[PDB]
Symmetry: none
Subunit: 90 residues, 6 copies
């Protein structure tokens, strides 16, 4: 057994004239799992460059008025650029 | 027996004329694991480079008015550039 | 013993004219574990470089008015650049 | 006149052999 | 004449042999 | 008249031989 007579995730507002009354629940079990095993290989963002490269006069901008991140976690495995706002060259 | 007559994540508001009454529950069990085992290999963001590179006059701006992070943790394994706002070159 | 009739995470507001009544629980078990075992290997941000590299006149800027981090811990393993606002080159 | 000789080869040999499950017994 | 020789070979051998599970018994 | 020789080879050999589980018995 696990849960019986339980009160788990509730808003109860018998009153009047209230505003923005809120209740949040998030559960994360076993997310963002990598398993690489026996004789496997992962090759990630590691190119082989023998050619010559001349990137010039590049401009990159990320701008925002505001970022609100409410109850929004970031879980990352073998990832890189996990974000709310991104501006990217190459 | 995990829970029984139990009251967990609850707002109760019989009062009146109130504002911004909030209740939050986050649980994080075993997230963002990386297991690597036996003969396995991960090669990550490590190029082999033999050609010449000549990046010039590159400009990169990340800007904001504000960042409000609430109830939003960051959990990262073999990750790299995990963020709210991001600007990236090369 | 641990729980029967338990009360875990609650706002009770029977009074009137209140504002900003808040209640938070975050819990974190066994997150961001990395395990490397037997004959395995991880190569991470450690390139092999024999080309010539001549970066010139590079500008990088990270700017904000304010950063609020409430109930937002950072849990990093074999990560690197975990942050709120991020400007990166190379 | 001018002479420039660039010699920069790359060689990336990998061998990964008996990393499986071999001859193991279960009961 | 004027001379430059630039000699920078790169060689990245790896060998991994019996790094698995071999002949183990479970009972 | 000028001569420049720049000799910078790179060798990164690795060998890993018996780092698995071998010949163990569980009872």
């Amino acid at each position: 057994q696990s849960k019986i007579g339980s009160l788990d995730n509730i808003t109860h507002v018998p009153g009047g004239g209230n505003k923005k009354i809120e209740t949040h629940k998030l559960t994360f079990r076993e997310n963002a799992k990598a398993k690489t095993d026996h004789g496997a290989e992962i090759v990630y963002k590691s190119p082989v460059v023998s050619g010559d490269t001349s990137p010039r006069h590049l401009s990159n901008v990320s701008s925002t008025g505001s970022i609100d991140m409410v109850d929004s976690p970031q879980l990352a495995t073998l990832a890189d650029e996990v974000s709310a706002s991104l501006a990217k060259q190459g």
